[PDB]
Amino acid sequence: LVHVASVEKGRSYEDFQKVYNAIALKLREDDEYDNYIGYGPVLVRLAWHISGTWDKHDNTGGSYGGTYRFKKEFNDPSNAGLQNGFKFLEPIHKEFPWISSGDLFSLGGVTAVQEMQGPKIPWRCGRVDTPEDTTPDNGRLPDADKDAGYVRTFFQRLNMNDREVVALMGAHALGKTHLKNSGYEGGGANNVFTNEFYLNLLNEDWKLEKNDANNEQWDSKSGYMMLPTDYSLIQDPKYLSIVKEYANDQDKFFKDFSKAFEKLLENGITFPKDAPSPFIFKTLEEQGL
Numbered sequence: 001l002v003h004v005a006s007v008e009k010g011r012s013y014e015d016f017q018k019v020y021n022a023i024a025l026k027l028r029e030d031d032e033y034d035n036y037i038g039y040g041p042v043l044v045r046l047a048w049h050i051s052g053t054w055d056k057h058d059n060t061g062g063s064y065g066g067t068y069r070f071k072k073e074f075n076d077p078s079n080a081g082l083q084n085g086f087k088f089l090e091p092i093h094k095e096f097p098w099i100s101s102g103d104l105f106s107l108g109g110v111t112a113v114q115e116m117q118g119p120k121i122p123w124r125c126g127r128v129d130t131p132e133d134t135t136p137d138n139g140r141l142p143d144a145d146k147d148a149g150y151v152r153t154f155f156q157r158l159n160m161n162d163r164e165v166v167a168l169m170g171a172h173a174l175g176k177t178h179l180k181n182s183g184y185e186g187g188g189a190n191n192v193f194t195n196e197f198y199l200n201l202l203n204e205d206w207k208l209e210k211n212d213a214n215n216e217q218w219d220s221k222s223g224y225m226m227l228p229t230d231y232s233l234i235q236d237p238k239y240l241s242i243v244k245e246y247a248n249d250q251d252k253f254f255k256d257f258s259k260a261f262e263k264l265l266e267n268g269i270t271f272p273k274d275a276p277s278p279f280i281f282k283t284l285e286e287q288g289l
């Protein structure tokens with residue numbers, strides 16, 4: 001099964017920079033969402049969930065088809081809460097009806113990472129909407145109550161190795177969990193992209209507690225939390241080494257995250273040899289906007 005990137009007709013870097021800018025300006029404007037976290041974190045999660053349905057074995061799922069717009073995927077219990085990100089992106093799509101849904105969802109994640117002071121994430125256009133019958137079934141996104149061996153095996157389906165997994169998980173510096181969405185009680189939250197997920201794993205005094213949904217999570221007195229799958233990264237000796245690396249090298253974390261996140265958002269897509277090079281968008285701050 002082959003999905004060939006097809007550039008939206010006549011569009012070029014400047015068109016997509018305009019879409020980036022509209023997303024970034026709305027991120028600035030709609031600042032009260034989720035107790036003043038803003039929409040950044042949920043847009044990153046949305047980009048990951050529309051990509052994380054991919055299966056390397058048959059090239060089903062993945063970001064290309066934009067299938068999150070269909071009820072089966074929109075209503076996946078694993079996607080609870082992401083409707084907020086979809087609703088955020090609705091006026092963007094109305095202003096720019098030419099961008100494909102997969103391009104918009106993935107660009108939302110890139111824009112959020114960069115605007116939250118994260119690394120530059122190169123981004124490629126050309127995802128094409130596919131029909132409702134191409135929507136992947138529920139159950140392809142990962143469980144949080146599991147251990148390191150589960151995480152490692154899960155991410156093999158996405159063609160990610162240990163370093164790529166530990167880098168991607170650093171996005172859990174962002175935002176919070178919400179009991180009503182996922183059965184996990186949120187702790188201290190931020191909307192600035194840093195390597196503090198790794199520092200928190202290594203430096204906090206973690207206690208294994210039960211939350212009000214009767215699920216186990218790791219909590220600290222500082223008010224931070226970790227899922228069992230997060231904490232597995234310091235229980236497994238191979239993951240632990242990489243956690244320590246990223247805790248001690250911000251730039252390395254940024255560079256590895258940027259590569260893994262672009263890869264995640266591009267899995268499943270065949271780019272023609274003459275496709276445009278990846279775009280690196282300027283932030284609002286870099287543009288003086």
Ligand code: HEM
Pocket residue numbers: 041042044045048080081142143144145151168169171172174175176177178179181182183184227229261
């Ligand atoms: C084993 C892998 C993973 C598991 C089990 C997992 C699970 C979860 C859960 C349960 C939540 C809370 C949802 C809610 O209650 O609102 C969450 C939030 C989040 N996840 Fe993950 N996740 C994983 C990997 C990732 C990856 C790879 C990324 C992106 C690179 C990511 C980005 C985020 C973000 C940014 C949030 C915060 C959303 C918000 O504040 O609304 N996650 N994740």
